[PDB]
Design a protein around this nucleic acid. Structure first.
Ligand SMILES: [Zn+2]
Lengths: 147, 69, 114, 91, 120
RNA sequence: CAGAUCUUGGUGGUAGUAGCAAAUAUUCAAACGAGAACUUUGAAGGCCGAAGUGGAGAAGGGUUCCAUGUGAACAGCAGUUGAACAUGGGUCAGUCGGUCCUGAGAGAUGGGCGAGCGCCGUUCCGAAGGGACGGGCGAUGGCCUCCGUUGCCCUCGGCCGAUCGAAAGGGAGUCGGGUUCAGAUCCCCGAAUCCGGAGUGGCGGAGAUGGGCGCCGCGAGGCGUCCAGUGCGGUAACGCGACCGAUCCCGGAGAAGCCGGCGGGAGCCCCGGGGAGAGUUCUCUUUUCUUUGUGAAGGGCAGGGCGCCCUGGAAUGGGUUCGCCCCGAGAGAGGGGCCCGUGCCUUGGAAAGCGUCGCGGUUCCGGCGGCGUCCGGUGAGCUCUCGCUGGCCCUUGAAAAUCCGGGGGAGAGGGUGUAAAUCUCGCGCCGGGCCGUACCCAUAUCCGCAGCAGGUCUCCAAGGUGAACAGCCUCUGGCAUGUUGGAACAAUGUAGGUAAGGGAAGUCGGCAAGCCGGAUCCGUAACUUCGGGAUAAGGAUUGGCUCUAAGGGCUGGGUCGGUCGUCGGCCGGCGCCUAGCAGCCGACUUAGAACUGGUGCGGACCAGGGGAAUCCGACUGUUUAAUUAAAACAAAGCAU
């Protein structure tokens, strides 16, 4: 997806109340490869690139593309290779604490979903761009504000 | 145009109620029949001079014109 | 010696202006404007790179003309699941399709026996 | 080798950009270009396609791995723990 | 006036060192001079393999060797075959003479002992 | 009114003065004419020299286009000419574009805001669909058979945004010959094609024609009853001429960058022969020069491409490219299938075109005839196109209209001579509105106050030397030296050159011009981020003419006897192209040698002066359009 070092993934689902094929663009976790069965919901077991709501995943499980508030379809920790860690639930008041990529610990509402595993494309900023032009071509593909 | 490679066609392609004219031109050695129809110039190559006179009379109506050469 | 001209009124070497030359009976080399050569279909599988054999390759709107035998292959799933897939995915369908239904039978057995 | 003593791939840059920048790049323009072995076939035909996406040559399977390497060692240890956490979640 | 010149350029005139301005590559490139040589030492190489003067195994090694230009024209390949193929033969004649004698007396050893075990 | 650098109008001296100098160049004769340095024809000498002083277009101009005529005015001299002036004439489309589609964006209703013209906003706080198959009923119509048709209802439908936005993107199908003072894919002649209609079926062919049983009849065959038939071939890729089908779902085409390599095809060039016409023949030249074809759409076949199938299973690993690459996830090897087919033959097509030689129409015919449009070969050549395969990205390189294939089976159809359907199979009929269409496209028709050395988007792209679209000369084509001529040859200029001896002594400063300047063969330092420095520096050679050596393609295998028409198909018998030889063609190249020249030889043109240090900026890049091109800004890197 131009203007992003985290390549997406065209997942194909099935509408269970009509008849057609629905497609999405998940941020692709790392390890995901085509022809793979990605699950989605509350009773889908732990494995990489498989969304399940924080609260039904054990303490210490690394997630990405974590939602802020239930239903906004992914907002936190979704850059090119970042990951939010779950820390410790609180099965009363139904809350959870995540350690976002910056380091600030958040008291996130539970029941909001997050695809497991780090985001593919990691380790991007380890190559010196080395050129004036190579930075130019990078910022031309995004909001046009380079020099 | 269309190439036609026998005789029986040349009548079924020239007995039609819409056909317009027949051109029987004497190329240097073969013969060329060209019946003009509404969509094609149905050309028959026959290489026998002593067979064109057989096919000159046998045209469906008396119409043997207009020929050139 | 060549003194040629675009015969139409467009004079910019764009994509819909490519040309080929020819030699008219009056012995005059003149342009002729060529219709672009389209590409034959691909597989509906999506994971095979080659094109279809059997399906005539021509621009889209020309397909209003050709007979149905020129636009597909008598094979089931013809002209949409590639001829490599006709050798692969139509293979790979049955082998995937029959057996997976057969496994459902096996699991309907071991579960029901108990 | 014999053509160049201590540059390698980054000899296509000449006397520019300095020394230490080119040394740091020489370890990245070797990882990314070189062909890995696709785990689904064993045929060393897994070549980087764009940033963070990899393509095979014979299986025709794209794998979303690291940005200059088939896997970043954190992404492997994350795959590690999630396996271990899967038994504890289900005893 | 241009033909009379070109019929002299073919022979060697007007083409010394005083009539060259282009680089040695420009007059006749190195990529082409190599390229046309691989298509001659490969073509000859596979006109021999099917003609059965060399065999599968030799056609491989000669294929890698010519790729590292240890053979620089056709004659020195036509000859370097006449050295290998010839000394391969003499080794065979001293190989199919060694085992023919070695075993004949070995089964003739096996026969002479069997005519012993019958006659006690 | 004397004035105000006064307002408007007018006229002088300057002054018959400055000036009519950017890009080589004109001359002789003739014609109309009152008149000729300039107009027109002819002869000669020159240039633009295919990145054009050529042949066409888009913006823009708007009648400048073409013809007849004029000598007021303008064309900075003149003019018999014009881009001027006065009359007339000219722009022909189903297929060339516009219209259709969406792109960055623009925009209205719903909503919100606003004293207010209105504004924000584009799925966003909206009852946003006006359409369809079938079915039940009422109801006409025309042979109220049957179907075309109509109103109510039952069903079905996602509303995912009205509209606008490209004469270069997407977007079906037209080519050849001729024709006028100006138009020609537009007109005439001749060949084709797309779309739409087909309604009572305009006609053929296809789905459609079986089997058993019982009768009789020798049989040919016919007599009757059941039940079938919405097509066949190939193991396979797939093929055949059509071969029912909806709501719904899936996918494909439309539909993707830049660069490098290689190969196929074609146009141009080149070489060798035949012809037809030509310039030279003072002497030589089987002579040098022009010319030597076949459209669209079908049909057949060469030629490229395949990540298509089948047999079999490979390490004493192979095959294979310029580089690669691929292989038990099935190599080589044999057989087949598909796609592209711009190429060759053929229908069009010799009738036409073209080159010559000859008649008729004394005249305005687009007339009549003889001959020909033949046979070859090379290529790292150039241009255009097609197809493989790599490289580069922290760049991954357009949307929609439209058209298509697949799945699924709601429905239709007839009961044994015929149906319903043809993702039209071959034909046949009818229709294709509307607007643009001349010309210039630039040292003259455009913008700069003009016939201004400025500026303004593209296609076509010959011969020679040469690395080359460099520079220079020539052919097809074009022109009169760019708003004038004549006579001389002073100074000062402007633009070019050379100069004895010294060589920066000149000057703020080697400012300017001057040396070096290509290529082959030798040789190459301090420094260094080990890549560079480097064409470092510094040497030698270069002409002609005659030779030498080396670097390649295509073809090959026997007397003998009978049969078949020592020559050949066959047999049997032999040969064993057995070391690899023999014959025919074929392109430019590289190294060496002899001889010769007033030692000249990258002989015009094109083509670097070097070395040792200091300061500054890392570099490539950018800027003060019209005085500052830098040490200024940017920049990757570092860090808050
Ligand atoms: Zn693989």
């Amino acid at each position: 997806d131009p203007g992003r070092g985290a390549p997406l993934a065209k997942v194909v689902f099935r509408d269970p109340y009509r008849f057609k094929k629905r497609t999405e663009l998940f941020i692709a976790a790392e390890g995901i490869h085509t022809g793979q069965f990605v699950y989605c919901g509350k009773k889908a077991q732990l494995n990489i690139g498989n969304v399940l709501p924080v609260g039904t995943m054990p303490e210490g499980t690394i997630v990405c593309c974590l939602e802020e508030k239930p239903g906004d379809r992914g907002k936190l920790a979704r850059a090119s290779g970042n990951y939010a860690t779950v820390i410790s639930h609180n099965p009363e008041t139904k809350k959870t604490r995540v350690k976002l990529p910056s380091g600030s610990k958040k008291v996130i509402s539970s029941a909001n979903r997050a695809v497991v595993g780090v985001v593919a494309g990691g380790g991007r900023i380890d190559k010196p761009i080395l050129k004036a032009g190579r930075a130019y071509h990078k910022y031309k593909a995004k909001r046009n504000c380079w020099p | 145009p269309r190439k036609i490679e026998e005789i029986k066609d040349f009548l079924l392609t020239a007995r039609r109620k819409d056909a317009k004219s027949v051109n029987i031109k004497k190329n240097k050695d073969n013969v060329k029949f060209k019946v003009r129809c509404s969509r094609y110039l149905y050309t028959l190559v026959i290489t026998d001079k002593e067979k064109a006179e057989k096919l000159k009379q046998s045209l469906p109506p008396g119409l043997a014109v207009k020929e050139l050469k | 010696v060549q003194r040629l001209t675009y015969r139409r009124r467009l004079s910019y070497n764009t994509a819909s202006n490519k040309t080929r030359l020819s030699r008219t009976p009056g012995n005059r080399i003149v342009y002729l404007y060529t219709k672009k050569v389209g590409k034959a279909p691909k597989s509906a599988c999506g994971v095979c790179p080659g094109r279809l054999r059997g399906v005539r390759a021509v621009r889209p709107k020309v397909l209003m003309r050709l007979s149905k035998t020129k636009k597909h292959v008598s094979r089931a799933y013809g002209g949409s699941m590639c001829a490599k897939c006709v050798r692969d995915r139509i293979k790979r369908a049955f082998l995937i399709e029959e057996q997976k239904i057969v496994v459902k039978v096996l699991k309907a057995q071991a579960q029901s026996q108990k | 080798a014999k053509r160049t003593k201590k540059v390698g791939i980054v000899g296509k840059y000449g006397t520019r950009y300095g020394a230490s920048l080119r040394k740091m790049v020489k370890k990245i323009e070797i990882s990314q270009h070189a062909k890995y072995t696709c785990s689904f076939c064993g045929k060393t035909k897994m070549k980087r396609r764009a940033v963070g996406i990899w393509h095979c040559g014979s299986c025709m399977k794209t794998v979303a791995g690291g940005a200059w390497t088939y896997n970043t060692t954190s992404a492997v240890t994350v795959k590690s723990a999630i396996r271990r956490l899967k038994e504890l979640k289900d005893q | 006036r241009c033909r009379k010149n070109t019929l002299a350029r073919r022979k060697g005139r007007h083409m010394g060192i005083g009539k060259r301005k282009g680089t040695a590559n420009a007059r006749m490139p190195e990529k082409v001079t190599w390229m046309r040589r691989m298509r001659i030492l490969r073509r000859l190489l596979r006109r021999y393999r099917e003609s059965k003067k060399i065999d599968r195994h030799m056609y491989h090694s000669l294929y890698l060797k010519v790729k590292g230009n240890v053979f620089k024209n056709k004659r020195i390949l036509m000859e370097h075959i006449h050295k290998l193929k010839a000394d391969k033969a003499r080794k065979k004649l001293l190989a199919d003479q060694a085992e023919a004698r070695r075993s004949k007396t070995k089964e003739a050893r096996k026969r002479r002992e069997e005519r012993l075990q019958a006659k006690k």
